[PDB]
Amino acid sequence: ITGGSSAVAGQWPWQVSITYEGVHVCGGSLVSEQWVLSAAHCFPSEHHKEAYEVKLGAHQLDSYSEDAKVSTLKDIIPHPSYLQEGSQGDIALLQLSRPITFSRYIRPISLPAANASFPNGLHCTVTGWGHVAPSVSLLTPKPLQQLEVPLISRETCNALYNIDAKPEEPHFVQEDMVCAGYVEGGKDACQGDSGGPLSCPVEGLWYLTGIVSWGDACGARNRPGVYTLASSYASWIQSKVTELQLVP
Ligand SMILES: [Cl-]
Ligand SMILES: [Cl-]
């Protein structure tokens, strides 16, 4: 996250770190005792499931915390519609090897209904442990970063992405996507933040409005972060979670 601030410990208790071979690659969101939502682009099919970990209840990644917990994965389920980079369906369900126990530091985020609408301009928050500036990693001990971002329609977002666009870097905000951020530079998600939550405040609660789909723009002008709408996958998520629910 560039142009944001350090969160306080436990402020975003659904935020997880996803590692591959011990290295943080993406964010994710805890949504139940055994499920994490992240982005499909974070999980190429050639990668081995057993090489991933999920770190929950963390604030400073490099600091020891008795409140943090680390898990492996039993399954990685990208949405079947996801094809190449940039395609619709950039969302994945990650099944933890064992269910975790909720705590004040480890809590699920509420999922929006299929028909839940979040209005243009709503001030949501994106969080993550990604770069704090282009090509510049968050320094040890790596406190979780947060940034307030107003929602931007996919239509406005597409027109912005077309300003000084390059054929070598194609972008299209799909029908299952929304944007959030600023027309001017300096405040957005960066490499390492993708897969993480866009958390929106509605009627006293917080909802997982979006999952960072394209978050590598890192504060470039006319490049607000692109997010997969969780509402577009409410039906699929409920189907998977219900069929695969564990014994209590
Ligand atoms: Cl569950
Ligand atoms: Cl459009």
UniProtKB/Swiss-Prot annotation:
Gene Ontology BP terms: positive regulation of sodium ion transport; proteolysis
Tissue: Found in prostate, liver, salivary gland, kidney, lung, pancreas, colon, bronchus and renal proximal tubular cells. In the prostate gland it may be synthesized in epithelial cells, secreted into the ducts, and excreted into the seminal fluid.
Primary enzyme class: hydrolase
GO annotations of cellular component type: extracellular exosome; extracellular region; extracellular space; plasma membrane
Organism superkingdom: Eukaryota
Keyword annotations from UniProtKB, A to Z: Cell membrane, Disulfide bond, Glycoprotein, Hydrolase, Membrane, Protease, Secreted, Serine protease, Signal, Transmembrane, Transmembrane helix, Zymogen
Peptidase S1 domain location: 1-242
Cystine pairings recorded for this chain: 26-42, 124-200, 157-179, 190-218
GO molecular function: serine-type endopeptidase activity; serine-type peptidase activity
Glycosylation-annotated residues: 115
Glycoprotein as UniProt keyword: yes
Coiled coil: none
E.C. number(s) listed in UniProt: 3.4.21.-
Residues of the active site: 41, 90, 194
Function text: Possesses a trypsin-like cleavage specificity with a preference for poly-basic substrates. Stimulates epithelial sodium channel (ENaC) activity through activating cleavage of the gamma subunits (SCNN1G).
Similarity comment text for this entry: Belongs to the peptidase S1 family.
Subunit annotation: Heterodimer of two chains, light and heavy, held by a disulfide bond.
Protein's UniProt name: Prostasin
Native organism: Homo sapiens (Human)
Gene (name only): PRSS8
First and last residues shown, out of full length: 45 to 289 of 343
